[PDB]
Design a protein around this ligand. Structure first.
Ligand SMILES: Cc1cc2c(cc1C)N(C[C@H](O)[C@H](O)[C@H](O)COP(=O)(O)O)C1=NC(=O)NC(=O)[C@]1(O)N2
Ligand SMILES: Cc1cc2c(cc1C)N(C[C@H](O)[C@H](O)[C@H](O)COP(=O)(O)O)C1=NC(=O)NC(=O)[C@]1(O)N2
Ligand SMILES: Cc1cc2c(cc1C)N(C[C@H](O)[C@H](O)[C@H](O)COP(=O)(O)O)C1=NC(=O)NC(=O)[C@]1(O)N2
Ligand SMILES: Cc1cc2c(cc1C)N(C[C@H](O)[C@H](O)[C@H](O)COP(=O)(O)O)C1=NC(=O)NC(=O)[C@]1(O)N2
Lengths: 314, 314, 314, 314
C-alpha cells in the first residue's frame, strides 16, 4: 500500500515497466475491480484455538496460501535482486518462483534454500527448454511453473539474463511432463476447458491468471474465472490465482472462491525496491498477519475452512 | 446529516475512531451503497387513521423499530456520556444498549430506567463474563446482546472502563443462555446458517451486522443478507439489522426487507457530541418523525405492514 | 434542456420549489437514471408514409402521447400562469391537467377550451372534494386525475389558491367514481397490485408515478414499474407514466415500455417561466417534432406500433 | 488513439460533424461502453504456426475481418478525399465502402481497384436509386451496402456530391435485390427479427449498427445485439458490426461475439485528416498488427477460431 509510494519515489520508467499492463490496461484494472466486488460471508462462533495459515501444496508445507510470483530481472529494482527476495521468502515459509529471465542464475537462487519453484518460458529449441527444466530439477526446485499465456509478449535494459523464445503448445507441456518428476504448473489458464485439459495433460497445478493484465488486453480477470475453474477441476490439480492480490482480505477472497494459494508479484517488488530483503520480509510479515486476521474474523481455523466460505458479488 | 458536521467541528482523532472502518473500509461504504440501491414499492389508498411506529420486541413495547447500538466509551464524545444517551433513549421509548466497555457503570445506566439492553463481550475467564450477565440481569436489563463477530478487534484513551477478552463460540452462547432468563441476542450474524443455528441455540434475536464495517473488511453488508436471513429464520427469533441507517426511509427499507428493528450507532454519538442529551433527544425526535412520514407515504399503518412491503434493487 | 438554463436565470428559491425532490432526492435522480438505462430496439424498413403521433385516450383524440402534468400555483412562474399553459396545450392538441391548487380558478382554465383534465386532492370534508369534482365536470373537464400518492406532502407563498386536506383511500376513490361519469385516473400508482385494484375499482386510467420524486424518498421510479404494471393491467385501463420525461426519445422509451401516454411537468414550467405561452407552445412544438422523429427512426408509423417495440436494459 | 489528437488539431466544426452523435449522444457513448464490458476468455497452448487474419466474404478474400465504413464527403477531411482512403484500403487488402454522398464519383473510386463496396441511400425516385446500383455493379463494385436505418437523418458544406431521398422499405430491398447479382448488405439492423427477415429477403449480409449513434438516440448498441442476431441468422448471411471499434482487441471482441467482420469509420477519417493516404495505410497497418496480436494471445490461428471464443460481461 504505502510501500508503492516508496517504490515510486526511489528509477522512474522502470516503475512503469513493473506496474504496467498491455494495451488500454483494461485487464490490469479489472483484476482489482473483480476483487473489490467480491464480498465474503463470514462465519461466527467457531473455535479458533489454533488458527493456522499453513497449507500443503506439492507435498510440502507452506506457511501461507501464497507464493512469490515469477518476475523477471529483479536487479532492476534492487542490487541484491532475486537473492534478497528468495531469502525473505525462505524465511517466511512461502515458495519463491525463479523466473527464466532472472538477473541471477537459478542455481544460486535454489542454493538460498526454502521452496524454489522454476518458471519456464518455452524456447524455440525444445532441448534448450528441457535443459532448463533439468537444471531446475537438479538444483532442488520443487515445481515447474510452465508459463503458457506467453506465445509472445503482449504489446530499456539494463542487467543480465543470468540463466543463459517460441509459443508453447500442449505438445510442449507433454514434453516437459515426460522430462521431469516435478509437478508441472500451467500459469495463465483462463478457459474452463483449458483447466480440464491441464488436468488431463497431467499438470499438478494451474495458475488462473491473465498475467497481471500484461498479455491479452481485454482478457477476463482470473478471479472472475476462478470459481468456475475450481468446480470443473474437481480437486484434480491445485488451482492458484494471481492478479491484484494486495492484502490478506484479498487472499481470503481468493481462497473463498476456491484457490489453493495466490501468487503475489508487484507488491513483492515494491518491498524489494524499498528496503531490499528486510523490506520483503516486512511485506511477508504484514501479509501473514492480515491473512491470519482475515481468517479469524471470517471464522476459519484453517485455509480449508476458508475455502468453504460463501461469497456474494456486489 | 448536518449533525455530523457539528460533530466534526467540535476532538479530531476521536472522530476518526467513531467514523472509521477496518482495512480499506470497503464494508463501511458498502453498508451505505447497499441501502442506497434498495427501492421501496409504496402502497396507496390505505387507511392511515392511526399510523403507529410502535413494535413489541422481547415482550416490551418500543416507540420505534429502533434501538441505540452499543458504542463504547461514550464520554469520549460528551462529559455526560452514556447517561445522557440513555436518558434521551428512555424519553423517546427506544431501547438503549449498554456497552461492556461503557465509561459509566452498567448499574448506573440501568438506573436511568427505560429499556436497557446489555452488550456482552466474552472475557477469557468464563465466569467473569457470566458475572457481567448476572449484573446486567440483576440491574433490570431486558436483553443480553452477545457480540459474536469480535473474536478479536478488526484491524489513544483517555476515560475509563467503568464496568471493571477471548473469542466467543457456540459453547459460550449456550453458557450465557443457560445462565440467564433474558433473551439472548447475537450481534454480528451474516451467514444464513449462522442465523438458523442461532435460533436452534435458543437465541431470542440476532442482529444482522458487519459491525459497521469495523471487523472483517470485505464482509458482506448486513442489509445485503437481511432478506435471506429473515426467510431462513421464519419468525424463529427477532431479526435486527444495523449499519448505515441514517434516516426514516432507511428504517423503512430495513423493515421492508424484513427486519424487526434497526440499531443506530454513529448518528446517536454525533447528537451526543453536539448538544448532549438534548441533542440525542433531538435526533430521536427527527428519526421518529421521518419513520412516521416514510411509513405513511408507503401506505403502512403499522411496522408489520411495512415489513410486507416489496422492494426492488436499483 | 437549454430551457432550464433560461428558467434558472429569471426568482431563485421558487426554482428550488419547482425542481426539488423529497429527502435525499434519491427518487428524483432515479427517474432520470431509470430512463437513461432503457434502450430501444428500433425496427427498420417499415412503411412510414403517414407517421402519426396521435392517440385516442378517454374517447378523445390527442395530438401526442402526452399531457401536461398537474403543477400547482403556475403564477409562481409567470403572470399569465395556468391560462398561458392551458392555451398552448389546447393549440398543441395535448390535454392539460388543472391542478386543485391552481392560481387561477378551474372554470377559467376549462373556458380556454381544449382537453382539460382536473387533478383532485382529497379534502378532509368529503363533500368539498366531491363538489370540486362536480365543478370540474360541469366546467367541461374530461377526466378526474385523482392524486392518491399524497396522504400528506412528502418532506413561501406568494399568489392564491383560486379554487377555494386528508388522506385518500379506496373508499374516497369509490365516492368519486360514483359521483362522476368522467373517467377517474389514479395518479401515483407504483405497486402492481394497486394497479390491478385500480382497474377493479373502476378507474379509467392510472399514472405510474412517484410524484417526480417529491413524495416518498426511496420510492421506486415509475418507469421501473411501468412494464410490470402494463402486463398486470392487461388493457383494463389506460396506463400513463411521468417523471423525468425530457425528450421525444424519452416519450418513445415510455411508450415502448407500454405507456399509453406520458405526463410532462417541470419542463412545461421552464417554458412558462421563459417566454410564457409562446414558450410553452415552443416546447410542445419541439417535443412534437422529437416524438415524430424518434418514432420514425424506430420504424413506428403509430404510437401503437411504438408500444410493440422491444427494449434492453443497459 | 493518438491519431484523433492529430485530427483535432488540424477544421474544427468539421470535427464535430465527424465525431458527433444524435440527441444526447447516448448511443454514441454506449457503443464504447458496450465494447469495454466485453471480456474475452483466451485459449492457451494451441498451435500458432500460421496465424492468419484473412477471411472470405462475398466470395472474395480479405486481409482482415474489417472493411472501411461508408463515410460521406471525405474531401471534408483531406484534399485527396476518398481516393486516398480507397488506395490505402486496396493496398491493405480490406474492402472499401463507397458512399452515395462521396465527394468523388464512384466510378473513379472503383477504378482504384481493390474491393469496392457501394453504400446505397434510397432516393425518392426508385429508378434513380436502381441506376446508382447499376453504376456500382458496372463499375466492378462487389456488394451493395443498403443503408436501411436512414429513412431520414437523425437529429455547413462545403465540397460536392460527385455521384449526382426517401425512406427505404422491404419493398425497396426487394427492388435492389431483383436489380443486381451483387450481394445486398443491409446496414443498420438492430432487431433480431429484422435480421431474420433480412435473410428471408435474400440479403447476403447485414451490418448490426446503430449508425455510430447518429440515428436514433437511445437505440441499443449493435454490439449488444450482435450475439443474439448471430444465433438467429444461423449462418444464413454474413453478420457485420460497427460502432466504436478502436483496436485489434475490439475486432477480436466483435468476432468472439460472432461477427464476420467489422466496419471502421471515424478512425479511418482521422488517419485521412492526418497524413492522407499514408496515414490511412498506417492505421490499417497498426490495426492489422493488433488484430494478429490479439488473436494469437487468445489462442486463435484463424478468424473462425476467434469466432468460437467465449466471452464474459463485466
Ligand atoms: C514486471 C513484471 C514481470 C513479469 C510479470 C509481471 C510483472 C509486473 N509476470 C506476471 C506475474 O507472474 C503475475 O502473474 C502478476 O504479477 C500477478 O499480478 P500482480 O502483480 O497484481 O500480483 C510474469 N509472469 C510470468 O509468468 N513470467 C514472467 O516473466 C513475468 O512476465 N514477468
Ligand atoms: C465507535 C464505535 C464503537 C463501537 C461500535 C461502532 C463504533 C462506530 N460498534 C458497532 C455498533 O454496535 C453498530 O454495529 C454500528 O455502529 C452500526 O452501524 P452505524 O454506526 O452506521 O449505525 C460496536 N458494536 C459492538 O457490538 N460492540 C462494540 O463495542 C462496538 O464495537 N463499539
Ligand atoms: C412544483 C411541482 C408541483 C407539483 C408537482 C411537481 C412539481 C415539480 N406534481 C408532480 C407532477 O404532477 C408530476 O408527477 C411530475 O412533475 C412529473 O415529473 P417531471 O417534472 O420530471 O416531468 C404534482 N403532482 C400532483 O399530482 N399534484 C400536485 O399538486 C403536484 O404536487 N404539484
Ligand atoms: C461523419 C460520418 C458520416 C457517416 C457515418 C458516420 C460518420 C461519423 N456513417 C456511419 C458509419 O457508416 C458507421 O456506421 C460508423 O462510423 C461506425 O462507427 P465508428 O465511427 O465508431 O467506427 C454513415 N453510415 C451510412 O450508412 N451512410 C452514411 O452516409 C454515413 O451516415 N456517413
Amino acid at each position: 500500500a504505502d510501500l508503492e509510494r516508496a517504490a515510486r519515489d526511489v528509477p522512474g520508467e522502470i516503475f512503469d515497466f513493473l506496474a504496467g499492463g498491455s494495451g488500454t490496461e483494461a485487464s490490469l484494472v479489472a483484476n482489482r475491480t473483480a476483487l473489490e466486488r467480491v464480498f465474503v460471508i463470514p462465519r461466527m462462533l467457531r473455535d479458533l484455538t489454533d488458527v493456522t495459515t499453513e497449507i500443503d501444496i506439492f507435498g510440502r508445507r507452506a506457511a501461507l496460501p501464497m507464493a512469490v510470483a515469477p518476475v523477471a530481472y529483479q536487479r532492476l529494482f534492487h542490487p541484491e535482486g532475486e537473492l534478497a527476495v528468495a531469502r525473505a521468502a525462505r524465511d517466511a515459509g512461502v515458495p519463491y518462483t525463479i523466473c527464466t529471465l532472472s538477473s541471477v542464475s537459478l542455481e544460486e537462487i535454489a542454493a538460498v534454500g526454502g521452496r524454489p519453484w522454476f518458471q519456464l518460458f518455452w524456447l524455440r529449441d525444445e532441448k534448450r527448454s528441457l535443459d532448463l527444466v533439468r537444471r531446475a530439477e537438479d538444483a532442488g526446485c520443487e515445481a515447474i511453473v510452465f508459463t503458457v499465456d506467453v506465445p509472445w509478449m503482449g504489446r530499456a535494459l539494463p542487467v543480465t539474463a543470468a540463466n543463459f523464445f517460441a509459443p508453447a503448445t500442449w505438445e510442449s507441456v507433454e514434453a516437459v511432463r515426460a522430462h521431469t518428476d516435478l509437478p508441472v504448473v500451467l500459469k495463465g489458464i483462463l478457459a474452463v476447458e483449458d483447466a480440464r485439459r491441464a488436468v488431463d495433460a497431467g499438470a499438478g497445478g494451474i495458475v488462473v491468471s491473465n498475467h497481471g493484465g500484461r498479455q491479452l488486453d481485454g482478457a477476463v480477470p482470473g478471479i472472475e474465472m476462478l470459481g468456475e475453474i475450481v468446480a470443473a477441476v474437481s480437486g484434480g490439480c491445485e488451482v492458484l490465482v494471481d492478479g491484484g492480490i494486495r492484502s490478506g482480505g484479498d487472499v481470503l477472497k481468493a481462497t473463498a472462491l476456491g484457490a489453493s494459494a495466490v501468487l503475489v508479484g508487484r507488491p513483492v517488488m515494491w518491498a524489494l525496491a524499498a528496503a531490499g530483503q528486510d523490506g520483503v520480509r516486512q511485506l511477508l510479515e504484514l501479509l501473514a498477519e492480515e491473512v491470519r486476521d482475515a481468517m479469524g474474523l471470517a471464522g476459519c481455523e484453517s485455509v480449508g475452512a476458508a475455502r468453504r466460505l460463501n461469497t456474494k458479488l456486489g
